[PDB]
Structures are given as C-alpha cells and as structure tokens.
Amino acid sequence: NAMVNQLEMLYEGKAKKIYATDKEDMVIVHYKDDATAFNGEKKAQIESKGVLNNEITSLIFEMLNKEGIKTHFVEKLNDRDQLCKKVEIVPLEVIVRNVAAGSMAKRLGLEEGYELKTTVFELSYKDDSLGDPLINDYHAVGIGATTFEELNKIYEITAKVNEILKEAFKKQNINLIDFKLEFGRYNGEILLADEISPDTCRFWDATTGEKMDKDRFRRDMGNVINGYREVLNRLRN
Amino acid sequence: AMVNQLEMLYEGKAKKIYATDKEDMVIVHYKDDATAFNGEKKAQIESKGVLNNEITSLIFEMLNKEGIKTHFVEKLNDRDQLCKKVEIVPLEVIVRNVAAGSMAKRLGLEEGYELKTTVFELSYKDDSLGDPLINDYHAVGIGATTFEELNKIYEITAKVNEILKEAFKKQNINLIDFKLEFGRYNGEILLADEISPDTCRFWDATTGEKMDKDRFRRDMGNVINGYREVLNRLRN
Numbered sequence: 432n433a434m435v436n437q438l439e440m441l442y443e444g445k446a447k448k449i450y451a452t453d454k455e456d457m458v459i460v461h462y463k464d465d466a467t468a469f470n471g472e473k474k475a476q477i478e479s480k481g482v483l484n485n486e487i488t489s490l491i492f493e494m495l496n497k498e499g500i501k502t503h504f505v506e507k508l509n510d511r512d513q514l515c516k517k518v519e520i521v522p523l524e525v526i527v528r529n530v531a532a533g534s535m536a537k538r539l540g541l542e543e544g545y546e547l548k549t550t551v552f553e554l555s556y557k558d559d560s561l562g563d564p565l566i567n568d569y570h571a572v573g574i575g576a577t578t579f580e581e582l583n584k585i586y587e588i589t590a591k592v593n594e595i596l597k598e599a600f601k602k603q604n605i606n607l608i609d610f611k612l613e614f615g616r617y618n619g620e621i622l623l624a625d626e627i628s629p630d631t632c633r634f635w636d637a638t639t640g641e642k643m644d645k646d647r648f649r650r651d652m653g654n655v656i657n658g659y660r661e662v663l664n665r666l667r668n
Numbered sequence: 669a670m671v672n673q674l675e676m677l678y679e680g681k682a683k684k685i686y687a688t689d690k691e692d693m694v695i696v697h698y699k700d701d702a703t704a705f706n707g708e709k710k711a712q713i714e715s716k717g718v719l720n721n722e723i724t725s726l727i728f729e730m731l732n733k734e735g736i737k738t739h740f741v742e743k744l745n746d747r748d749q750l751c752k753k754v755e756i757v758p759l760e761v762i763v764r765n766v767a768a769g770s771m772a773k774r775l776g777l778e779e780g781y782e783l784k785t786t787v788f789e790l791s792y793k794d795d796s797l798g799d800p801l802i803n804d805y806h807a808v809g810i811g812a813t814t815f816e817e818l819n820k821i822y823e824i825t826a827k828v829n830e831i832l833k834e835a836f837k838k839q840n841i842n843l844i845d846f847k848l849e850f851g852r853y854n855g856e857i858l859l860a861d862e863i864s865p866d867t868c869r870f871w872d873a874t875t876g877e878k879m880d881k882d883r884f885r886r887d888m889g890n891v892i893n894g895y896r897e898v899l900n901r902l903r904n
C-alpha cells in the first residue's frame with residue numbers, strides 16, 4: 432500500500448545519507464558503500480557493505496523494538512534504505528566495552544582482548560573536527576551537551592541494550608566486544624537512533640577470535656564483506 | 669624525639685620520598701625541579717621547592733583543622749614535611765571549576781569558559797602512558813580502584829574544593845582547577861601528595877593574572893613571583 436515519498440537530502444555523513452520525506456517527523460536513512468577510518472585518512476568502497484549494514488541494523492532494531500526499547504526504527508524499505516523517526520541527535524557517542532580493544536586498550540597499556548573487571552560505559556563528544564574526544568559525564572553536562580538526568584536515562588537504556596545484544600550474539604558464537612550507540616529526542620522522548628552494525632560494533636568469533644567487523648577494513652585484513660555476511664547469516668539462524 | 673630520615677624510597681619529578689625510622693611515616697622533600705610536557709621540558713626554578721613545601725603545609729594544616737583526613741603531620745624544614753606513609757591510589761583526581769588547560773584545548777573552548785557543573789575527572793597515574801584521561805568505569809575495569817573507593821574519593825574531593833575555593837576567593841584568587849591524590853592508610857582514604865601552584869591553577873579574580881606553574885609551562889616570565897604571591901596571600 433501507501434509508502435512515504437523521499438524528498439530532499441538533509442545530510443550526507445561518512446557512511447549514510449539522511450533524506451527528508453513527506454512526513455515531517457520521518458526520515459529515510461540510506462546506507463552507502465563508503466568505508467572510512469582514522470579521522471578521514473583511510474577510505475574504501477566496499478561493495479554491498481551498505482546493504483549488509485542496512486540489513487543487520489534493521490534486524491537488530493526490530494529485535495530491540497520487540498524487547499521494548501524505544502527506537503527510531505520503523506521499517507526497512509529496500510536493500511539500502513530504512514524509514515526512521517526523525518530525531519534531534521544528542522551529540523554524544525555512547526560506547527560500551529565488554530572487552531578492551533582498539534585505541535582504548537592501546538591508551539591504557541592493555542592487551543587487546545583484556546577482560547574488563549566491570550562493563551565499561553563511556554562517552555565521546557560528537558565533533559569529528561575535535562577527533563570525537565573521550566569525555567566524562569561532568570564534561571558533557573559542563574559544556575551543555577546533556578543533563579545529568581538525560582545521561583542517566585541514556586545509560587539505563589544502553590545497559591539494557593548491552594544485555595540483550597550480548598546474549599543474542601553469544602547464542603551465535605559471537606563475542607560482542609564493544610559497540611557505539613547514538614540517541615536522539617523525538618516527541619520529547621529519548622530514542623535509540625543511528626545504526627548497530629559491523630561498522631559500529633566489534634564482533635569476534637567466540638572460539639577463534641576471528642574479527643567479523645570493520646576492523647578488517649581498518650587493519651587491511653581482507654575479506655571485509657565476508658565477515659559482515661557471516662554476522663548477518665548467524666543472526667538469521 | 670624527632671623522627672629520623674632514612675633511605676630514599678622514590679625520586680619523582682618534583683619531590684623525593686624518604687623512609688624514616690617509623691614504618692608508617694615518610695618525609696616528603698621538595699626539589700626546585702620543574703617539569704612539563706611528558707618530561708620533555710625541565711628547569712630548575714630557584715626556591716620553588718621551598719615555596720611549594722610552605723604552601724602545601726599551610727593548606728594541609730587548614731584542611732586538617734577542617735576535619736579532612738590527610739597524610740600531613742608537620743612541616744620539618746624549608747623543603748621537608750613529615751607525612752603518614754600511604755599506598756597511593758594510582759589516579760590523579762582533577763577538579764575544574766572553570767575550563768582551562770587540557771580540557772579547554774581538547775574541547776575547543778576558550779580558557780576561562782564557564783562550566784554548567786563543577787568538573788571532576790580522573791587521569792590514570794602512569795607517566796609512561798602520558799597520564800591519560802579515564803572515566804570511573806575504566807578505573808574500576810582495569811583494577812585501579814573500586815566504585816566504593818571512588819565514591820569516597822569524590823566525596824572528599826568535593827569537600828576540599830569547597831574549602832579551597834573559599835580560602836582562595838577571600839584573597840581574590842579564583843581556584844580554576846587542581847589535581848589531588850589519595851592513598852590508603854589503616855583502612856581509610858587519606859588526601860596525600862601536594863596542593864601548591866605546581867598542582868593548581870590560580871588566577872587573580874580581578875585581573876586574571878596567572879600565579880601558578882603555567883608561567884613555567886608557557887614561558888610567561890616572573891615565575892617564582894607568582895608562587896610567592898600565592899603564599900603571601902594565603903598568609904594574610
């Protein structure tokens with residue numbers, strides 16, 4: 432039956448385009464094949480990456496919606512596009528680390544794979560020109576990016592999302608190492624928004640440690656799309 | 669009578685820690701060594717150690733009298749103080765009342781930016797890693813501390829900020845930011861280390877004159893004068 436009409440492009444980011452629609456409070460999120468890392472210094476076109484990321488995001492957000500998480504996700508429209516509630520993004524990346532990896536393990540002198548003694552929650556300030564710096568709750572409130580009570584709600588939702596995702600991935604022999612979330616305001620409510628995909632998570636096979644995510648691109652490991660396909664195929668088991 | 673200084677336990681960038689003939693006491697000896705930028709910048713600043721020992725001693729005596737549990741027992745001489753020997757928790761606990769220095773630089777703010785809330789932050793005390801900014805979850809997650817210990821540290825830190833902000837404001841100094849360290853001692857958390865113009869930013873509340881180690885860091889000149897000014901004001 433009736434479908435939204437895609438109107439003007441509102442924004443093009445590193446990996447997606449956001450389009451207006453004929454509904455003032457809805458956008459279409461379009462997944463590109465662009466891959467980027469290292470403050471824009473590293474790029475590639477990874478054929479079909481956007482299709483896989485749209486498909487994985489859609490599957491995960493449908494699952495989160497069913498678990499009662501309030502999210503922007505309405506429906507997948509085609510191989511690359513999904514219909515979402517238009518949100519005013521809170522300018523914080525919310526990162527969960529179950530295991531220490533990447534730059535974070537590096538900055539603290541930890542072996543990659545270090546088992547953290549408590550689940551890590553952290554914030555990066557969403558400003559690519561400042562390099563998306565790590566900040567704490569007081570910095571975030573102090574510069575007017577958020578309030579204590581907004582952060583409290585964000586953390587509650589984030590912790591629930593981690594419990595749900597850790598378990599869904601564990602069932603399929605995937606360790607959910609870390610991931611990044613974004614939230615936004617819609618109808619005065621705090622919604623989970625953006626993407627949850629191998630671009631925004633670290634996924635290691637639980638037996639071999641094999642990486643099935645964007646680190647295969649960041650570290651020139653090859654078979655990038657095969658790792659993303661494997662994540663989707665396991666999620667669809 | 670007087671405790672006896674025995675072997676050196678540790679030489680840091682600014683102070684030496686000496687053992688004493690009491691197993692639960694150390695002597696903290698203030699050098700004239702100045703350092704900045706991950707050890708890359710160094711100088712000797714004549715009498716800096718004396719002024720920092722004098723300022724630290726004055727401040728810790730005040731905090732002791734206000735009921736803060738600290739390591740400080742007594743000043744011994746121009747450079748030395750007698751302190752309880754603590755097991756330092758490996759965190760630099762930084763308070764920022766106004767954004768300046770590294771916070772201002774990394775968040776693209778002007779120094780002097782007014783904050784909507786007092787900032788409490790941690791750096792991991794590991795000079796080989798450059799004392800990186802970390803959050804509470806990182807600190808607990810790597811085994812540096814526990815949530816219960818951090819909670820206590822922050823409660824003491826907030827109290828110390830209130831006392832120091834007021835003592836400095838009475839002398840027309842804005843306490844812009846500062847760094848504390850804490851240690852474990854006989855089951856408790858004590859304020860330890862130093863509170864001086866090496867570990868605080870002090871701006872005159874009217875003119876903005878900087879009276880702290882930024883004068884050394886930024887080659888501003890008249891460095892020791894600034895330290896003398898802070899001590900003289902504290903002694904009004």
Ligand SMILES: Nc1ncnc2c1ncn2[C@@H]1O[C@H](COP(=O)(O)OP(=O)(O)O)[C@@H](O)[C@H]1O
Nearest residue numbers: 444445446447449503515516517518520624625
């Ligand atoms: N539901 C939404 N409404 C409006 N903006 C969104 C929504 N979900 C995500 N965004 C924003 O859209 C952009 C998605 O594209 P992306 O390529 O990830 O951009 P960026 O390069 O800015 O990180 C991001 O800026 C993201 O914060």
Ligand SMILES: Nc1ncnc2c1ncn2[C@@H]1O[C@H](COP(=O)(O)OP(=O)(O)O)[C@@H](O)[C@H]1O
Nearest residue numbers: 526532533534535563609610611630631632633
């Ligand atoms: N700006 C961003 N856009 C998308 N995903 C991100 C971003 N920042 C962090 N992440 C995700 O958050 C997790 C932690 O990233 P991090 O370790 O901080 O980056 P790196 O180690 O690659 O420097 C990873 O899964 C990463 O994919």
Ligand SMILES: Nc1ncnc2c1ncn2[C@@H]1O[C@H](COP(=O)(O)OP(=O)(O)O)[C@@H](O)[C@H]1O
Nearest residue numbers: 680681682683685739751752753754756860861
């Ligand atoms: N009461 C105390 N007992 C034991 N160690 C202490 C005490 N107070 C401070 N310290 C430690 O003594 C050293 C003081 O000298 P400093 O030059 O500041 O060293 P650093 O270069 O390690 O920062 C620091 O490592 C500090 O943590």
Ligand SMILES: Nc1ncnc2c1ncn2[C@@H]1O[C@H](COP(=O)(O)O)[C@@H](O)[C@H]1O
Nearest residue numbers: 768769770771845846847866867868869
């Ligand atoms: N390793 C350190 N030693 C002494 N003082 C410090 C240290 N790190 C931060 N400070 C103090 O903490 C405040 C914030 O410093 P910065 O992070 O450089 O802006 C300033 O008053 C510094 O002098």
